[PDB]
C-alpha cells in the first residue's frame, strides 16, 4: 500500500508511524590547483553554478576572500614572496579557516561538494588537504589548470584581476605589473600534479592548452564523471546567447496554459520584429533552436535562417491541466492550484511535470549551449526561466518567478566570472504576464 | 503556414512544390590504435552499438576480418613477422580494401561514423590514414588502447582470441602461446600516440591503466565529445543486469494502455516471486531501479531492498491515447492506429511520444547502467524493449517488436564482445502480450 505525495506526486509507502515516531536525521572536496590567473576561480564559480542548477548543493571556498577579510588593503606582490614569513603564516591560517568552513558545510549544513579554490601549488599543501579529506571521510578531486600562453594569462588579468578590490588604489598598467610579479613568486616552488609517478593514486583532471588537452585520473563516482564531462565542454571564447519566447499564441489570448496553438496576428508581428532585430545584431553565424511546439517554429520561420527543433525545449507539461484557463484550474482543482503557489519549483502537475523535471530534461541543452558560439533559443516561459536561472545563477526557489515577458529578447554576454543580461523589448503588444494580472 | 507530419508529428512548412519539384539529394573515421589483445575490437563494437542506438549510423571495419577472407586458415604468428614481406603486403592490401569500404560507407551509403579497427601501431600507417581522411573530407579521431598488465592481456586472449576462427585447429595453451608470439612481433616498431610532440594536432584519446587514465586531445565536435564521455564511463568488470516489467497491473487486465494503475493480485504474486528469485541469485550488492509509476514501485517494495525511482524509466507517453483500450483506439483513431503499425519506431502519439523519443530520454539510464555493477531495472514494456535493443544490438526497426512478456526476467551477462540474454519466467500467470492476442 502506497500513497502519492501532494506536491511532487511521488509514490511512497504509507508511513503508519508507530505512536513514538522515530526519525533518522559521501561528500567531495574539489581542490583547485595552479598559478595565479589560470582560471581557477572562473572554473570554481561556473562549475558550482552548473552543479547547483542540476541539484547538487555546492559552494565555493575562495581562500583569496578569506585573505581579503583577514588583512584589508592589499598593497603589493611583496605579500606573496616565499621569504615573507608572517604572510606565509597568514596565508596558511586563511587556508585552514577555509577548511574549517568546508568541514562545516559538508558535515553539518547538507552540502555535497565544496570547491576549495586556492593556488595549492606544492605537494606539501596538497598532502595536508588530502589529510583533511581522509580524516573527515570526504573524497578529494583535484582540478589543475595549466596555462603557458602569455596572451591568455594577460587577458585573464585584464578581465578579472585589475578590477579586483585588491587593486582598488591602482591603475591598469601598474596592477598588471604587480600581478606578473605576484605570479613569479610561485614559480620556483610550483609542483604540477604528476599522475605517472607521485600522484598515481589521486583523482584529478589537468586542464591544459586552453581547454584543449585533458589528463583524467581515477574518476571514482557519478558526480566526478559529470564534472569531467562538463569541464571538457566549456570554452572561454566570447559569444552571445539570446533567449526569447515564441510570439504570442492563441492560447496566450484566451489565457489557456500549455497546448500547441499557433501564433496570433501580434505573435506574427513579433516574429517579424525578431527577424529585424537579429539582422541588426549583424552576427557572423547564428544558430537558432526551437522547441517542437508550433508557435516557436513559426517564430523561427520568420527569420529565414536554418533552425533546429528540440523536444527538450518544449513547455513544461501541465498534465490534467493542459489547455485549461487559470480560472478553470482554480475552480476544478483548488487543491492543486494552492499547492503549486506554495512550492512552485517542486510542484508537479498530475500526470505532468515540475520545474525540477524541466531541469533534468534541459541538461543536454545546457551542455550543448556551452559548446556553441552565437545562439538564439526560441522557447517557452518555464523553459526560459529554467535556462535563465542557470546562466544568472538563480536558485531553485527564485527560478519559477524570474520575469520573462512576451516579445522580449534576453541577451546574455560574458563578463568577469558570469553573464550579463540585457533585455530588448521588440515593441509589439501582447497580453500581460499572469503575475501582472494578479496584482 | 505549417503542417504537422502524420507519423512523427513534426511541424514543417507546407511544401507547395512548384510544378517541377526539385529535390536536394562531415563524417568521421575513428582510428583504433594498439597492440593486439588490448580491447580495440571490444571498444569498436560496443561504441558502435551505443552510437547506432542513439541514432548515429556507425559501422565497424575490422581489418582482421578482411585478412580472414583474403587468406583463409591462419596457421601461426609467423604470418605477423615484420620480415614477412608477402604477408606485409597482404596486410597493407587488407587495410586499403577496408579504407575503400570506409569511403563508400561514409560518402555514399549515409554512414556517419566508420570505426577503422586495426593495430595501426606505426606513425607511417597513421599518416597514410590521415591522408585518406584529408583527401575525402572526413574527420579523424584516434582511440589508442594501452595495456601493460599481463593479467588483462591474458584474460582478453582467453575471452575472445583462443575461440577465434584463427585458432580453429588449436587447443588453448597453444593458441595462447601463439598469440603471445604474435604480440611480440609488433613491439619493436610500435610508436604510441604522442600528443606533446609529434601528435599535438591530432584529435585523440589514449585509454590507459585499464580504463583508469585518459589523455584527451583536441575534441572537435559534438559527436567526439559524446564518444569520449562514453569511453570514460565503460568498464570491463563482469556484472549482471536484470530487466523486467512491473507485475501485472489493473490496466493490463482491462487491456487499457498507459496510465498509472496499481498491481493486480497476480502482479503482487509476481512481485513476491521476484523477491524470491532475487534472493536465490545471491548477489553481493544489487541496485534496484524503478520508474515513477506506481506498479513498478510496488513491485520493488516486495523486494525489501533499497531502490531508486527514475522518471526517465516511465512508460512511453501515449498522449491522447492514454488509458484507452486497443479497441477504443482502433475505433476512435483508425488513422493513428494504422500509421503506428506501419512505422512503429518513428511513430509518435498525438501530444505523446515515439520509441525514438524514449531513446533520448533513456540515454542517461544507459550511461549510468554502464557505470554500475549488479542492477535490476523494473520498468515498462516499451522502455524494456528500448534498453534490451541497446544491450543486444537490435536495430530501430526491430526494437518495438522485441518479446518482453509479463512476469519474465531478462538476465544479461557479458560474453565475448557482447551480452548473453537468459529469460527466467517466474511462473505467475498474466494476461497475454498484445501480439499473441492478434494471432
Swiss-Prot record, chains A, B:
The answer to keyword Phosphoprotein applying to this record is: yes
Enzyme nomenclature, EC number: 2.7.1.105, 3.1.3.46
Catalytic activity annotated for this protein?
A: beta-D-fructose 2,6-bisphosphate + H2O = beta-D-fructose 6-phosphate + phosphate; beta-D-fructose 6-phosphate + ATP = beta-D-fructose 2,6-bisphosphate + ADP + H(+)
Where are the residues marked Transition state stabilizer as a site?
A: 245, 252, 380
Chain segments carrying region Fructose-2,6-bisphosphatase: 238-439
MF annotations from Gene Ontology: 6-phosphofructo-2-kinase activity; ATP binding; fructose-2,6-bisphosphate 2-phosphatase activity
- What positions does UniProt annotate as the active site of this protein? 117, 147, 246, 315
- State the residue spans of region: 6-phosphofructo-2-kinase: 1-237
Keywords per UniProt: ATP-binding, Hydrolase, Kinase, Multifunctional enzyme, Nucleotide-binding, Phosphoprotein, Transferase
Binding residues for beta-D-fructose 6-phosphate: 67, 91, 119, 125, 161, 182, 186
> What are the disulfide bonds?
none
Q: What does this protein do?
A: Catalyzes both the synthesis and degradation of fructose 2,6-bisphosphate.
Provide the assembly information: Homodimer. Forms a heterodimer with PFKFB2.
Q: What is this protein called?
A: 6-phosphofructo-2-kinase/fructose-2,6-bisphosphatase 3
Corresponding gene? PFKFB3
Amino acid at each position: 500500500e502506497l500513497t502519492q505525495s501532494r506536491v511532487q506526486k511521488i509514490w511512497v509507502p504509507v508511513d503508519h508511524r508507530p505512536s513514538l515516531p522515530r526519525s533518522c536525521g559521501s561528500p567531495t572536496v574539489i581542490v583547485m590547483v595552479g598559478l595565479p590567473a589560470r582560471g581557477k576561480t572562473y572554473i570554481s564559480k561556473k562549475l558550482t553554478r552548473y552543479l547547483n542548477w542540476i541539484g547538487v548543493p555546492t559552494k565555493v571556498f575562495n581562500v583569496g576572500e578569506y585573505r581579503r577579510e583577514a588583512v584589508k588593503q592589499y598593497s603589493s606582490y611583496n605579500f606573496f614572496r616565499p621569504d615573507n614569513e608572517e604572510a606565509m603564516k597568514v596565508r596558511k591560517q586563511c587556508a585552514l579557516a577555509a577548511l574549517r568552513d568546508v568541514k562545516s558545510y559538508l558535515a553539518k549544513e547538507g552540502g555535497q561538494i565544496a570547491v576549495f579554490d586556492a593556488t595549492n601549488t606544492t605537494r606539501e599543501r596538497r598532502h595536508m588537504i588530502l589529510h583533511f579529506a581522509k580524516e573527515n571521510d570526504f573524497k578529494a578531486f583535484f582540478i589543475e589548470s595549466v596555462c603557458d600562453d602569455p596572451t591568455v594569462v594577460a587577458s585573464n588579468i585584464m578581465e578579472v584581476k585589475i578590477s579586483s578590490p585588491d587593486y582598488k588604489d591602482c591603475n591598469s598598467a601598474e596592477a598588471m605589473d604587480d600581478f606578473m610579479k605576484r605570479i613569479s613568486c610561485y614559480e620556483a616552488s610550483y609542483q604540477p600534479l604528476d599522475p605517472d609517478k607521485c600522484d598515481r593514486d589521486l583523482s584529478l583532471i589537468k586542464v591544459i592548452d586552453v581547454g584543449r588537452r585533458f589528463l583524467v585520473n581515477r574518476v571514482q563516482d557519478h558526480i566526478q564523471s559529470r564534472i569531467v564531462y562538463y569541464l571538457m565542454n566549456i570554452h572561454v571564447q566570447p559569444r552571445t546567447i539570446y533567449l526569447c519566447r515564441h510570439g504570442e499564441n492563441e492560447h496566450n489570448l484566451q489565457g489557456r496554459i500549455g497546448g500547441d496553438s499557433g501564433l496570433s496576428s501580434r505573435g506574427k508581428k513579433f516574429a517579424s520584429a525578431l527577424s529585424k532585430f537579429v539582422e541588426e545584431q549583424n552576427l557572423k553565424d547564428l544558430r537558432v533552436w526551437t522547441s517542437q511546439l508550433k508557435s516557436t517554429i513559426q517564430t523561427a520561420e520568420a527569420l529565414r535562417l536554418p533552425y533546429e527543433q528540440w523536444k527538450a525545449l518544449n513547455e513544461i507539461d501541465a498534465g490534467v491541466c493542459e489547455e485549461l484557463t487559470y480560472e478553470e484550474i482554480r475552480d476544478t482543482y483548488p487543491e492543486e492550484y494552492a499547492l503549486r503557489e506554495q512550492d512552485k519549483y517542486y510542484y508537479r502537475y498530475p500526470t505532468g511535470e515540475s520545474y525540477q523535471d524541466l531541469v533534468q530534461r534541459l541538461e543536454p541543452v545546457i551542455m550543448e549551449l556551452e559548446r556553441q558560439e552565437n545562439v538564439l533559443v526560441i522557447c517557452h516561459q518555464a523553459v526560459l526561466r529554467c535556462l535563465l536561472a542557470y546562466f544568472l545563477d538563480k536558485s531553485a526557489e527564485e527560478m519559477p518567478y524570474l520575469k520573462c515577458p512576451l516579445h522580449t529578447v534576453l541577451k546574455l554576454t560574458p563578463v568577469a566570472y558570469g553573464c550579463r543580461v540585457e533585455s530588448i523589448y521588440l515593441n509589439v503588444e501582447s497580453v500581460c504576464t499572469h503575475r501582472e494580472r494578479s496584482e
